[PDB]
């Protein structure tokens, strides 16, 4: 319920569904003759969250739907989507042949969902996803993250010399493979620079890298890189708790802690990211399109005087709750400070239920034990059991352990 303390106006696609048999039934149809053609991309979304044997054999046959059409590509697109989601080895036979193919989006999507299904793939098949390997950059980058994953090193030869690729989406993927499978955590250091590139894909790239090469020293280089701490946070779990335990050994449960509550005038930025201390430029920073500004923008807020901040904070906040960008900083800079006086926003942030809105639960849940909000513990209690997602369920925990 964020729209109601918006100015601004979230508004959601909700789209009905189908039921399990007439998805099944619309899904291999011809779209020429269907009631309500749509249905058929939502009916391969639907079988992907079924379970039976018959919708995933039908998933397997929109899979391989002739793509001599326009609206049966599509189709075998989310199929695809689908039988990763639905995580059986039944399904390797078909994302092969999708590497095959021409429509490279599929591929793309064939190879994640292979990386999904994790299952143990042969000597044939590593060499048929290394045919996938030899396209354009974007989809390289998939297929070495694949190997990187699935944990695949016959194809050490391949991936090697890409390394020196002149790409650094392509060459900090190669990289990340020869820490994780080839066991030389030493081509990583050019990531560390890369998490400050000037260009925000390469640092974004750099942490995405850094924690599928499982090099849990690289932890510090996360606390304080400028990109989104949701990203920071997946790959600094990735090093700490690789096997998902929700259990990060308190020999770093200080360094996550502090990438964790985000302070944004302790992460590393430039110059050119950082705007003047004034009403309107801390708000076109938080409304940029890249992180890095708007850290910037967020670090020049808790820059201004307090008096001024209160007030800056509260037009902000009428303005654009219900955009997740600025609830999140908002949230974040009330936490980080300690503004009792704006102790609702941090109730507000970690009372959502919207999941788009998760990372400000984090920094309303560290804004709590900043601020001693005591009350909060049975909301705290609650996540620190059932939230869904791991460094939420794990804030929770560290502060109901102090929170006095």
């Known amino acids: 319920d964020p729209n109601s303390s918006s100015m601004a106006e979230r508004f959601d696609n909700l789209v009905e569904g189908l039921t399990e048999e007439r998805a099944m039934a619309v899904i291999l149809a011809d779209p020429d003759s269907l009631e309500r053609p749509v249905d058929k991309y939502m009916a391969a979304t639907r079988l992907g969250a079924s379970n039976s044997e018959e919708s995933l054999d039908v998933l397997i046959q929109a899979a391989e739907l002739d793509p001599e059409h326009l609206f049966n590509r599509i189709t075998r697109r989310k199929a695809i989507d689908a039988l990763g989601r639905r995580k059986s080895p039944k399904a390797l036979p078909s994302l092969f042949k999708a590497?095959?193919?021409?429509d490279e989006a599929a591929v793309i999507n064939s190879v994640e969902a292979i990386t999904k299904i994790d299952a143990p793939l042969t000597e044939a098949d590593h060499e048929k996803l290394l045919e996938a390997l030899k396209g354009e950059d974007i989809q390289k980058r998939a297929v070495i993250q694949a190997f990187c994953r699935l944990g695949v090193p016959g194809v050490i030869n391949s991936i090697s010399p890409l390394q020196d690729d002149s790409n650094p989406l392509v060459a900090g993927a190669a990289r990340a493979y020869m820490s994780k499978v080839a066991l030389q955590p030493d081509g990583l250091e050019?990531?560390?620079?890369?998490?400050?590139?000037p260009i925000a894909g390469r640092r974004r790239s750099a942490v995405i890298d850094l924690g599928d090469a499982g090099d849990v020293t690289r932890l510090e280089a996360l606390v304080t890189a400028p990109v989104s701490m949701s990203l920071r946070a997946r790959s600094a779990f990735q090093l700490v708790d690789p096997d998902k335990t929700c259990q990060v050994p308190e020999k770093y449960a200080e360094l996550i802690?502090?990438?964790?509550q985000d302070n944004p005038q302790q992460l590393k930025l430039r110059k050119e990211w950082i705007?003047?201390?004034?009403?309107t430029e801390i708000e076109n920073n938080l409304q940029h399109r890249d992180e890095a500004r708007q850290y910037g923008g967020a670090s020049s807020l808790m820059a201004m005087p307090k008096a001024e901040r209160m007030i800056l904070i509260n037009e902000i906040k009428e303005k654009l709750w219900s955009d997740y960008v600025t609830h999140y900083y908002l949230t974040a800079v009330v936490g980080l400070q300690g503004l009792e006086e704006r102790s609702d926003l941090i109730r507000?942030?970690?009372a959502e239920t919207i999941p788009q809105y998760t990372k400000s639960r984090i920094a309303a849940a560290w804004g709590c034990l900043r601020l001693g909000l005591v009350d909060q513990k049975p909301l705290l209690e609650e996540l620190s059991?059932?939230?869904?997602?791991?460094?939420?369920?794990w804030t929770c925990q560290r502060v109901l352990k102090q929170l006095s």
């Open 99 to 102: 590497l095959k193919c021409s």
């Open 190 to 197: 050019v990531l560390i620079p890369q998490l400050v590139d």
């Open 257 to 260: 802690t502090q990438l964790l």
């Open 275 to 279: 705007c003047d201390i004034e009403p």
């Open 348 to 350: 507000l942030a970690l």
């Open 385 to 393: 059991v059932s939230a869904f997602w791991l460094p939420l369920k």
